[model samples]
Target: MDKAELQKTLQANKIQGNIVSSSDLGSGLSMVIVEVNNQQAPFLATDDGKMIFQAEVLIAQDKSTESRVQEFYKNLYEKEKLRISAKLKEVFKAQKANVFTFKAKKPSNKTIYIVSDFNCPYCQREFANLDKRLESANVELLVVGFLGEDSILKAANALKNKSGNQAKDIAMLQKLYTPKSKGQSMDIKAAMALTQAVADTGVRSVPYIIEPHHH
Candidate 1:
């Protein structure tokens, strides 16, 4: 969708925001960043900042081999998004202990738990785009550090800090995922230690999302 169309939709959906910036990131990728007003929750696009939506539309219209691959990717992305969103909502409504909750200006429907490496570019992009929706959905996110050693240290520090600093944790993750670096060494020892700490819970991967228990 075009900028005007997107803005209109946002308004109709009660997505509170004032546009901050929009730009094409080359290779058919574009982003629109907005600084939300009167809301403590940050916003990020739910569909990879529109690329996924555009891809889905293109896939539906094309019958070529490339179109098939695009359709596959689009379907995968949508499935994962739904799973994560549902898992978050489940965690919230159940009031499951040990699940971290990011308090928003209003009540949220879900809680998200992410295990990530500090150096994954895709992770950075996904996080940026999902920020706003998570906030608006009243979804709390619990980020786990599992990419490598440094990531583990960062996660441990965040967990240990009494301040419960969400922004600092986000900054740490962003620093690891953003454009400045990629394919770097991670702290394996730190990562393993962190994993062991969570071993009793039976989680096996970074970003191991859990849903709430049904009554």
Candidate 2:
């Protein structure tokens, strides 16, 4: 679907929360946080405020109602997110593909391929936890960008200027992880190059981990 259609769909869903803030957290990932109405918060409160609501609604209806509402929101978010992602991939596919690799200690047995956006939160969390593992395991970490516009820029910039040992690349990755780095623009030419490359790959998600030969 086109951009207008997507917006209309989201509006029709009545996704109540306003997008309070947005950030491009690096690695081709962008985060938009919404502050939802605390409709059930009062019922769940433990003080005298909870006494105002009926016990039946508080005990049985609250959890179930909230769960259903949350699930609905989640489904709507996923549907719209996926639609946008697909369109992005299509737009990017006409470009080129720039992939980068890093090795901490050179694993004796495995090659781990990570499809990551420099801005992905979960990927950053995993990176924080796995940096030592990568060092200890001596494994090869290959990170590819397939998330969105910003991700393509970071990935392309790193690949286009991959100088010396992986130290520079690693440093760049770290830089992209900072919150202040969000929505930061890169060199226009570099960004365009990355976008083209990503489009060529047809990848739609960030941190697409692939443990070769292990399914």
Candidate 3:
């Protein structure tokens, strides 16, 4: 199934959180994992609204409602703020994706990781102003399709090409970063995972800027 169908399954089930990922295991092999309201887990699912069992479905361990478990999640956010936020930040770092920017690269802590969306108005401005805003410092717009499927598609398209052209890539991203009022979602596996990883760490807001390697 496509991303839209996956989303439909999520809404109909009234599931806790939502499916924040669609990973392609390999050629034609795919699976979607559901992220619970207050927790992240391996709630495996498919395009036709079917579930792959074990782990979270077990009544004994799915004690998500238990007060202590809820408290534990809360503390997980608090006690591990650095630990929690670091995953996505590092995930991107660990990626070999093309880094597109015109700013001169220098060894400095002034670099910033922008957790931004294509359709986010604020993000659009940030995307356009990277040169002025983060001059001389490294910056990467961690594009997440927070707006819709189109947004994800746009981001996926952006990631598909680098061409070693800074002006071209920047212009492409700026043009994609516009205000659209419909069909919002993240279907690309890379952006999907990073966006959800950050969300699970208590960062649900778009335009969230993160500077990395903070431990």
Considering only N, C-alpha and C atoms within 3 Å, which residue pairs clash in candidate 3?
147-184, 148-183, 148-184, 148-185, 149-185
The order by descending TM-score is 3, 2, 1
- Tens-digit lDDT string for candidate 1 (1-215): 25665576577667667655444433444445543531122122333343222332333233554544454446555655564456444533453332334554467554445444444455555567556646554334444555554555544444444144556655654554555453344344534544454532433454444433345
Which ten residues in a row are the worst by lDDT in model 2?
38-47
Candidate that beats the other on lDDT, 1 or 3, i.e. the better one? 3
TM-score winner: 3
Index of the highest-lDDT prediction: 3
| Model 2 per-residue lDDT at 6 | 28
Show where candidate 3 strays beyond 4 Å: 1-80, 98-109, 181-202, 212-215
Tell me the tens digit of each residue's lDDT in model 2 across 11-51: 66665544433333233222333334411111111121111
Tell me the lDDT of candidate 1.
Answer: 0.47
The sequence of per-residue lDDT tens digits that candidate 3 reaches over residues 18-40 is 66555443333344555665445
RMSD of each: 18.0, 13.5, 12.9
